[PDB]
């Protein structure tokens, strides 16, 4: 197994007005296996970002999602990537982010930009699903199974964005739906979990 280093070139500064949604791209280096843990640094190691319903880090693509930018977000951001199987971490050149203040931010409707795909699982496996929306105000994320009850042990984590189903049974397969919403509008996304037992 392995994990190359991030490129040397600098990541150009970004100026974005408060209220807008943005995504900071991790752009992880070549690697194997693909069981990485993603984190983001603020300005320098080992100062890690605060995560909450407004700032989300995807464990599939490593991107940092910020529902709506706030002045307090000012800082430089680096993607910190760890491969547990080889006890190794590499992080990237920093994206300097410079919020542009606004006296009244523009409302944005919840828009889902992290969309889980169909998943196939063996009976017994754990399944994890991610959903997240840009939006101003910060959108609320809700989960449900389409026209069926959720598996009884399913857990919802990371400020609403992550649905985990444990020790998945055949009965758990079906179409799951993510709903995102703020007062300005809503969005939803659906896909299927298949269980092969």
């Amino acid at each position: 197994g392995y994990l190359d280093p991030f490129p040397p070139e600098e990541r150009p500064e970004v100026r974005v007005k408060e209220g807008k949604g943005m995504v900071l791209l991790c752009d992880p280096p070549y690697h194997f296996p693909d069981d990485l843990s993603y984190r983001w640094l603020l300005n320098e190691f080992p100062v890690f970002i605060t995560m909450d319903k407004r700032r989300f880090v995807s464990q599939t693509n490593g991107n940092l999602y910020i529902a709506n930018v706030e002045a307090s977000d000012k800082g430089n951001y680096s993607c910190f990537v760890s491969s547990p199987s080889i006890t190794k971490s590499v992080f990237s050149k920093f994206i300097p982010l410079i919020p542009i203040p606004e006296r009244t931010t523009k409302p944005y409707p919840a828009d889902i930009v992290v969309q889980f795909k169909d998943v196939y699982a063996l009976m017994g496996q754990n399944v994890t699903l991610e959903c997240f929306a840009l939006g101003n105000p910060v959108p609320d994320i809700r989960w449900r199974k389409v026209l069926e009850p959720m598996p009884s042990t399913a857990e919802i984590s990371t400020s609403g964005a992550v649905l985990k189903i444990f020790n998945i049974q055949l009965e758990d397969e079906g179409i799951y739906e993510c709903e995102a919403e703020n007062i300005r509008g809503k969005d939803k996304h659906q896909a299927r979990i298949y269980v092969q037992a």
Binding site: V16, K20, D111
Partner: protein, 266 residues
Amino acid sequence: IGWSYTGALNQKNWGKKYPTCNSPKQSPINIDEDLTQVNVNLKKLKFQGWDKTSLENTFIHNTGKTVEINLTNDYRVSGGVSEMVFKASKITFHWGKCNMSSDGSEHSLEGQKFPLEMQIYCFDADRFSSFEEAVKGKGKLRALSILFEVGTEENLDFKAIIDGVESVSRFGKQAALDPFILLNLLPNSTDKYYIYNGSLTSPPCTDTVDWIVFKDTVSISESQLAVFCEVLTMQQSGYVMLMDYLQNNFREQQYKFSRQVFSSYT
């Protein structure tokens, strides 16, 4: 795709990745009637299938650059310079900030810009399997431009289109259109039109579009115009993606370079 109107690789730079965008045959242009050549030998426009209702699998897709409708019916159109038959397959839209006084359109008439322009793109179904292939191969293309003015009452012939535009507000969203009659999206009279040789109005700016621009506008209401500015778009710059309302998604006007613009006679 990988460009933008204003921003990274803005419309003035397109030529760097897409050379054809710099050719002397680019659209859009301004058209003044009295500078056109009245051509009474123009063949009358002929629309086949356009009065029939849309098929159920007709999707509208928010591409982040426009909202694009991929037609399914066997729509056909002939007329203008020749009676060559083309197949209509794609509709796109260009707008500004969605106000009556606003600009937004790409083409202009007598120097006037309109709040919204719809464009119907066509190809030769006999030389190509699709419009995309026709583009890739620099086949003869044909585009009809319909310009809009804000009226008072909602234009019901556009209800299905507008609801569609709403339903793909979110970036990348796709949705099936309710039934609509394509020919009813055109101006009440289509006899008066201009025709000139141009190009696609965004990369790769393919140089082979016969443009038909209609002289009579179509009317829609304010609330109708408004949904276009509720469309969201995500665009990459460097290592970041930025979300914005999609606005002013029109190309700046190009120079005619001695191209001739024909005008139909009525």
